[PDB]
Amino acid sequence: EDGYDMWLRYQPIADQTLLKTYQKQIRHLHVAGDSPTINAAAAELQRGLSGLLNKPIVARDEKLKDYSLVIGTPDNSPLIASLNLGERLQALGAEGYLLEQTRINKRHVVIVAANSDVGVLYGSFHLLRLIQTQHALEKLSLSSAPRLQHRVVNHWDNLNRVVERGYAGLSLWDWGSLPNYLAPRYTDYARINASLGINGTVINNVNADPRVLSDQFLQKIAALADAFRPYGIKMYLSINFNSPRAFGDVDTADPLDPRVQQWWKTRAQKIYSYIPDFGGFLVKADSAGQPGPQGYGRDHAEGANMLAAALKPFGGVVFWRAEDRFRGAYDEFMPLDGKFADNVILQIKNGPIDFQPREPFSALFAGMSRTNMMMEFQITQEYFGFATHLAYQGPLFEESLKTETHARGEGSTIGNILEGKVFKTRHTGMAGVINPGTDRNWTGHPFVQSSWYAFGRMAWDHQISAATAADEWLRMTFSNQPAFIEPVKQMMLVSREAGVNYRSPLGLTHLYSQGDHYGPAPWTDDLPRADWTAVYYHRASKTGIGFNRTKTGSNALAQYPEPIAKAWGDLNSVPEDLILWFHHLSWDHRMQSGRNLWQELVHKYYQGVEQVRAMQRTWDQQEAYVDAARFAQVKALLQVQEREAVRWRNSCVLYFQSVAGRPIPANYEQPEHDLEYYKMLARTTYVPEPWHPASSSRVLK
Amino acid sequence: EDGYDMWLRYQPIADQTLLKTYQKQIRHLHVAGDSPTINAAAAELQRGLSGLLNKPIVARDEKLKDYSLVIGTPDNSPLIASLNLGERLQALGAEGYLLEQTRINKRHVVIVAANSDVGVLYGSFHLLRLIQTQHALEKLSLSSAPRLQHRVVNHWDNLNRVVERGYAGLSLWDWGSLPNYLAPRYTDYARINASLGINGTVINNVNADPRVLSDQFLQKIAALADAFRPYGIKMYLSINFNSPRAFGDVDTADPLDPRVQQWWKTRAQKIYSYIPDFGGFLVKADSAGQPGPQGYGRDHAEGANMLAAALKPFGGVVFWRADRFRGAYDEFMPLDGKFADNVILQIKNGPIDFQPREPFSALFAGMSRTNMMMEFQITQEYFGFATHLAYQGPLFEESLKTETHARGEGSTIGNILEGKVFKTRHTGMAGVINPGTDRNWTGHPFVQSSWYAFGRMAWDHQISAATAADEWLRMTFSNQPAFIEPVKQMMLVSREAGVNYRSPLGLTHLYSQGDHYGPAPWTDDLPRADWTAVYYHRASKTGIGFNRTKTGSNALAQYPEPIAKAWGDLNSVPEDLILWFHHLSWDHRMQSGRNLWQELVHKYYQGVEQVRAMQRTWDQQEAYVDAARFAQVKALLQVQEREAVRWRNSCVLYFQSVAGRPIPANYEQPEHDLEYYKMLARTTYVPEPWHPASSSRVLK
Ligand SMILES: CO[C@H]1[C@H](O)[C@@H](O)[C@@H](O)O[C@@H]1C(=O)O
Ligand SMILES: CO[C@H]1[C@H](O)[C@@H](O)[C@@H](O)O[C@@H]1C(=O)O
Ligand SMILES: [Co+2]
Ligand SMILES: [Co+2]
Ligand SMILES: [Co+2]
Ligand SMILES: [Co+2]
Ligand SMILES: [Co+2]
Ligand SMILES: [Co+2]
Ligand SMILES: [Co+2]
Ligand SMILES: [Co+2]
Ligand SMILES: [Co+2]
Ligand SMILES: [Co+2]
């Protein structure tokens, strides 16, 4: 195996007793419909059932045979219509489905039924997933519908095909041969995403290139959209707010200028002439040298609404990305609550800083009550070790979605807020920055596939656990052997926390080398902005560490609902895993463990390395259950991870020691090298990413 | 089929009668030896014979069975030794081999016999190739030995994994996971190269990163060298001449400074501790802001010899890379004889820079006391990146069979390289392949054929482009004669088509600078005139061409007298080179009867028609090719035709604007005007990750 199939591995069921049972239950595949989407579902079931059941199962439209899988909607399949599903289908809406073992004219059947063709597609993938994961079909009766409307992936891909925060190869999109060459991989990409119910893609970098709106590129993009359409995936583009100027058509991009308004309306007309079901726009504006409305003295609602007005006649939406930097997004956007148009959705990262290994929830989610919102999670491992560290992100996503905000009573979880139940809003969604590439296994590190998987599962149902998604993924990707699943599932579940522990435990954050983000640099000071440095966030000194965000410091806690401000502001109740986000504490503060804060910091850094070492031992125990190639690859990558984790640990412990002046407790292995040595390693250790200039650095001392 | 196997496709022989014959001839595989290299040969034969013959053939060391393939050297295989092959075998040297149907102890056998283990490996690949190309084994008796010593590939790969002039993905070398992860692909890379007898690789860019010589990277590089070693491929590195300074160890890199001499000696000792059979260095120096000896007021021999002295105790070599036309010749000729015996001057086929046709580099006929090797380009820097179909076999054949008259008749470029003209110590050729992580290694499927042809010609420089194409098509696509003939001819015309729609008649250097994707024959006003196009063509209202005769730059005087004579005389100069050497009036009448203006138009239009004919030919092959590669090549040919039209229109309209002559009415008038094509040059996507032009946001 080389990862190309990801979790859609349609190999014969290994449990021979179970295989025989499936073979008895599904002897035929009945498909009456013939739309592109139903055809895609039929093709997936034909290849999937044939592979899993080890016999030729061909989709046919013929008189119903005993022991058939029958798929369709009441509108395209008279067999489905005859069951008179009624209210049972009503609950499923536009994208849901019902899977059920039943009878049609005394024939034994399993149905995949829906209101829409895309619901049939999603249900077909779930039916395959039940078999892939060795679940029984006898007495099957289940229905499901997605809990969020816009379930999207994001690709930070430059048109030169280098991917920003891209650790898995070049951009999938081969502009040089588009629109002429419809590569099979474009269809495989659509299959991967549709298998999770992902229904949208933003294919181009948020650091946006205006060329994507030119005819030259719209023709190429349309060819991708055509490949994606049968699988239910709408096309979206990141836009450059200054495009009217870049195209030399208008001497300003001010959204209140009628010529600018018209430029975008005319451009939307052009887009929809190529892509009649185009989803809309992703916008990064006035952030990091990206142009925006504030460049013309206008606010973000004025800019978003101008774009939204251009898209509204075509049914498009705008995904608008949202002294103490922690306070920034909330302070910028809270005054605009209620000012955005109904087809604008504010796309907000899980936390207020930037995808750090642990962040508290973004206060905007509990504060904006009159604005559509959507979550943005990161899959690509910008902060979790590129393609060389194993870091299943399921637990990060779950932790986020199940976080209680107390916005409006108990049950105001991030997930319930996203679903729209808390504040009663129109558009809902989640976006996942996946940044795959042309590597054979799409994601570089095999385990990044598990993070993509969990994100799509959770976008469908935000209460799905990291454990459940890992169990599925492991079954689908590797093995159904219980003795494999349990230890590898636990290895996955600990991997995120390991990555917190050897980098920045206890509420520490932003300790990375700038701007490449591969390795440690907790000493970083003196950049163009203080909030780019590490020292700004940790504030370590001889007496203590941490950033005071209570009422006696920046009072960022007042940005949160009262119950959260209260819990996090009191040392007696604040979780230790967030503590240094909100409190500057003396090194002698005693933690729950009985250690002082210095000792606890050291313990966590050393624990992260030990957790990696334990993952290595776990993986080595699985040799009998995994193919030799992927086995060897993951074993090797875990060796790289352990070496880097040691570098992280030694770099940060020695750095913080240099500031606190306390000894590393004697039981721990003392670093043989000094802090200067680790500063030298930070300057000289290869940064394994094509995009960031640090990978080209010739510094050797 | 996704290209990953390239030409090593071990699928059952499609001709059922032939398949049965092979199955009767090779029923067993006998391998007595067990060195890493013999094991690699055995593994290749096991997978290849099993695939091709559609039955399990397992390498064994057991009592000889009737109808066996028996491989080895006299030293490792008593069966082979028992044949007492003597002089016939020994004459094939350290890399040659004998393939022969014979008998041993009354058993019917086919032997793969050699003097060395790598010779067994090479012969094993040829044995497989005979089967793959549906050649008969009955009465087989054939021997071969390579005609050049150093048969190397070059990769212009940056350590960030972006490839310079790289149109086939990221660099293969995954530095972030090395040395720990020995990816299967590293072994497959070695297999591909060893199947052609390629015995060296320079893995990193000539625009050299000094970190390759650090312990951090040497550890990584050694892991690659380890993967390559069983396949007979030595590791080489491009070096940065300023490394002593970059490492902070010396405040100069002057090769006459004893501290510099010692720095390189110590560094070589370090390298050879990691890689005991390290091949040596490739060097690009004092070229385009690359550091070199001239930066310290020293000459290229002083610089090369300093590096060479560091490598000599370990048996390593230095591949030193060599009116702009007269540059090279005038720079190295004074140094002929001044280079050490482990220095080899690596010279591009022509004096400019891999242009679609160039006259031979005069250095090849001039340097009579210096080791030389050829450098050819496979990656399509000047032939359309990964979107154009351009088999390069004809370019390499054209070069290698060129008579130079260096020491009278018989002084072909190939004979010079081989050491038959000037007595020499080291011989070779280097091929700039620049593959990457794309599934098919080369982006465009047909770039594989160029890599193939280069490897066959490095082994035997008299192999034709046609012979190499025949083999590659059989191995890669189909053995059906009705397929082979038209697709072979399509391949053979593809180079010339790429000359014709870009720069026929001796025109050159008409590309967009510095990305090189599209036309820009109007380019003037760069920091150096010899970067522009107009410098080369000198087009005016009265004529076109560059005078390199005795009345102009006299570059022809750099060639042997019979070439200077032939090319200086309008009566004998080949028309396909004419504007390299003569500035001619537009009314000059060509052999066709057209005037030069008319002939220029005819050639540009011919190139487009040649691409359209390639399209029609390919469409006729749908029955013989798998659906996926069929569709891919079909689509790429559409892109190529669109780009060829852009090239033709841009250049014809440009030259028209200068000559002020009409395009004859039997040619289709361009869709738009010259300004429109200047706009398309600014705005047409440049499909390469490396060159900054692919990031250009210019829209007008
Ligand atoms: C795509 O830009 C990224 C950027 O690479 C990273 O440094 C950070 O600033 O986040 C940005 C974002 O989320 O837009
Ligand atoms: C690798 O550098 C190349 C360069 O990309 C190209 O522009 C030309 O100058 O040739 C150089 C060379 O052959 O060294
Ligand atoms: Co994988
Ligand atoms: Co870039
Ligand atoms: Co919506
Ligand atoms: Co574990
Ligand atoms: Co202490
Ligand atoms: Co191919
Ligand atoms: Co680069
Ligand atoms: Co030699
Ligand atoms: Co043809
Ligand atoms: Co005329």
Coordinates of C-alpha atoms and ligand atoms in Angstrom, one line a residue, chain B residues 156 164-165 205-207 284 321 348 353 381 516, ligand 2:
Chain B
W156 CA 19.2 20.6 -10.6
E164 CA 15.3 24.4 -11.1
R165 CA 14.0 23.8 -14.7
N205 CA 21.7 21.7 -8.1
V206 CA 24.7 23.1 -9.8
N207 CA 23.6 26.4 -8.3
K284 CA 29.5 25.3 -11.7
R321 CA 31.4 22.6 -16.1
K348 CA 27.1 21.3 -23.2
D353 CA 22.5 26.9 -23.8
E381 CA 13.7 23.9 -20.4
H516 CA 11.8 30.2 -21.0
Ligands
LIG2 C1 21.0 25.5 -13.5 O1 21.2 26.8 -14.0 C2 20.9 26.9 -15.4 C3 19.9 28.0 -15.6 O2 18.6 27.6 -15.0 C4 19.6 28.4 -17.0 O3 19.0 29.7 -17.0 C5 20.9 28.5 -17.8 O4 21.6 29.7 -17.4 O5 21.8 27.4 -17.6 C6 22.1 27.2 -16.2 C7 23.1 26.1 -16.2 O6 23.2 25.3 -17.1 O7 23.9 26.0 -15.2

